[PDB]
Amino acid sequence: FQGHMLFISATNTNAGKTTCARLLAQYCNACGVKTILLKPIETGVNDAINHSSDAHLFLQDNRLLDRSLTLKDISFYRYHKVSAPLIAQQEEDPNAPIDTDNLTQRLHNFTKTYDLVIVEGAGGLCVPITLEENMLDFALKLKAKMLLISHDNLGLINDCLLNDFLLKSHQLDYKIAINLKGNNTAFHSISLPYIELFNTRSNNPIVIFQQSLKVLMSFALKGS
Amino acid sequence: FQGHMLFISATNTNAGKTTCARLLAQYCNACGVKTILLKPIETGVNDAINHSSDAHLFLQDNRLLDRSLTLKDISFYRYHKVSAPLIAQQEEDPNAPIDTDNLTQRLHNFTKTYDLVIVEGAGGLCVPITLEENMLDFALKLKAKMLLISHDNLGLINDCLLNDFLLKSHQLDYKIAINLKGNNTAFHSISLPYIELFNTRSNNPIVIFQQSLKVLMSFALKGS
Numbered sequence: 001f002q003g004h005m006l007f008i009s010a011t012n013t014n015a016g017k018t019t020c021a022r023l024l025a026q027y028c029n030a031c032g033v034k035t036i037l038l039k040p041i042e043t044g045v046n047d048a049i050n051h052s053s054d055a056h057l058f059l060q061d062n063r064l065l066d067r068s069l070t071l072k073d074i075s076f077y078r079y080h081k082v083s084a085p086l087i088a089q090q091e092e093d094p095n096a097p098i099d100t101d102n103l104t105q106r107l108h109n110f111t112k113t114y115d116l117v118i119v120e121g122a123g124g125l126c127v128p129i130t131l132e133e134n135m136l137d138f139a140l141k142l143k144a145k146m147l148l149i150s151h152d153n154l155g156l157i158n159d160c161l162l163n164d165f166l167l168k169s170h171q172l173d174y175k176i177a178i179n180l181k182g183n184n185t186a187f188h189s190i191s192l193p194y195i196e197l198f199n200t201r202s203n204n205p206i207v208i209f210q211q212s213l214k215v216l217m218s219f220a221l222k223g224s
Numbered sequence: 225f226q227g228h229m230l231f232i233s234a235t236n237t238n239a240g241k242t243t244c245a246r247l248l249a250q251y252c253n254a255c256g257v258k259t260i261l262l263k264p265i266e267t268g269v270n271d272a273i274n275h276s277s278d279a280h281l282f283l284q285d286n287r288l289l290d291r292s293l294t295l296k297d298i299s300f301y302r303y304h305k306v307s308a309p310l311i312a313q314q315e316e317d318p319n320a321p322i323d324t325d326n327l328t329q330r331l332h333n334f335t336k337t338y339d340l341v342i343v344e345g346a347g348g349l350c351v352p353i354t355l356e357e358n359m360l361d362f363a364l365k366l367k368a369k370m371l372l373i374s375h376d377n378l379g380l381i382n383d384c385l386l387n388d389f390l391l392k393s394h395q396l397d398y399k400i401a402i403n404l405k406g407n408n409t410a411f412h413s414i415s416l417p418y419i420e421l422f423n424t425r426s427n428n429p430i431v432i433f434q435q436s437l438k439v440l441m442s443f444a445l446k447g448s
């Protein structure tokens with residue numbers, strides 16, 4: 001088999017995809033599992049003046065494995081508008097719809113040279129890419145496994161379970177992981193009691209990302 | 225037929241259920257459609273010291289139609305903890321699980337005396353009530369129509385469409401309405417372009433609450 005592919009989505013923008021992706025790739029690389037970070041679609045950027053977008057952060061990490069990589073090797077559709085990608089594309093690049101067949105080829109080409117290809121999405125599972133496809137559709141076309149990152153605040157129960165319902169209704173292997181930030185102990189008192197109950201009753205438990213680097217590495221790499 | 229019943233849920237706590245419920249009930253009552261507001265389950269309250277919970281606000285509105293109403297007539301399970309109702313119940317009232325058969329009877333009794341019974345939920349569609357039921361399950365047992373209120377910020381696309389997927393996967397009549405707050409014009413530039421596209425492609429469009437009091441009154445009251 002060629003390298004494994006793990007898509008990283010989230011309950012919400014700013015839940016922690018980039019933070020968690022970078023931590024997981026660092027952990028895998030430290031275990032000798034050669035791992036690249038890709039951000040194929042990114043909104044909210046201005047590359048002429050700012051070098052700290054997600055693709056820039058990924059690029060810094062990635063060049064520890066390949067100095068020759070450049071931004072355009074790991075991120076392909078980039079927009080200024082802080083919006084769903086479909087809208088940003090229609091406004092800023094009307095003649096170039098996002099081509100997910102092209103993306104699928106470019107992402108799978110990295111499975112030749114990496115043990116694990118981590119793909120950060122944008123927006124959320126239902127956020128529109130093209131007129132006919134959302135982020136989940138893209139992940140399904142990739143045949144990737146899915147890591148959905150949740151925020152750690154009140155509301156995470158509802159958000160996790162809305163995504164669980166959508167994911168379980170589709171043919172893909174997925175995990176949900178809560179990105180539990182430092183200084184948050186309300187989580188343990190308010191939300192954790194239900195996560196624990198849910199996990200006794202579910203075949204696919206919701207985990208805490210920070211407790212789960214080994215589990216998530218195992219998940220990403222298992223099988224064919 | 226006896227009075228109609230409309231359940232009000234949301235994308236997130238604080239999206240605007242109470243605000244929108246009170247506006248819709250006021251509009252219906254001003255049209256001669258006798259409407260009561262109920263908050264059967266409420267967390268985060270301390271009735272010994274605070275009289276501005278959702279049930280208190282509903283009670284003030286409701287007593288314009290019936291002076292004899294009291295808090296216990298319109299709200300039945302009330303907890304101090306700011307959490308999902310299941311957790312608050314297990315911690316504060318371990319011997320009294322929330323009984324949704326009891327709730328269904330109490331809520332339906334108001335269809336004798338009102339043209340429309342508006343029922344605010346808590347937490348979100350997937351938030352747990354009992355070990356076996358969430359808010360959506362409660363609304364399904366009620367046989368109510370559903371009004372899901374969305375927030376108006378970046379992220380509303382994903383949130384609305386996650387709820388749309390869950391709702392359309394169940395046997396109930398529902399609308400999604402965005403609670404568009406004053407002073408928000410980013411909405412029109414950032415999110416509205418996709419809502420408009422989605423609505424051309426959907427048999428059940430996402431509306432803006434503030435544009436939709438007549439439409440939503442019609443929805444709540446139509447048919448048997």
Ligand SMILES: Nc1ncnc2c1ncn2[C@@H]1O[C@H](COP(=O)(O)OP(=O)(O)NP(=O)(O)O)[C@@H](O)[C@H]1O
Pocket residue numbers: 010012013014015016017018019020054122123179180181182
């Ligand atoms: N565990 C954490 N501890 C402390 N800060 C965090 C943590 N996770 C995320 N952050 C901060 O929260 C912000 C958002 O996190 P980030 O990982 O960029 O989210 P994201 O989901 O990738 N955002 P986006 O790609 O724009 O949708 C950043 O400033 C992070 O540094």
Ligand SMILES: Nc1ncnc2c1ncn2[C@@H]1O[C@H](COP(=O)(O)OP(=O)(O)NP(=O)(O)O)[C@@H](O)[C@H]1O
Pocket residue numbers: 234236237238239240241242243244278346347403404405406
């Ligand atoms: N359209 C609006 N314009 C201005 N303020 C609003 C608007 N909608 C909601 N708010 C305020 O936002 C806060 C939350 O609204 P509220 O209607 O109480 O939400 P909710 O969904 O019922 N909350 P909860 O029942 O606790 O889950 C309140 O302080 C409201 O006054």
Ligand SMILES: [Mg+2]
Pocket residue numbers: 017018019054120
């Ligand atoms: Mg990111």
Ligand SMILES: [Mg+2]
Pocket residue numbers: 241242243278344
């Ligand atoms: Mg409320």
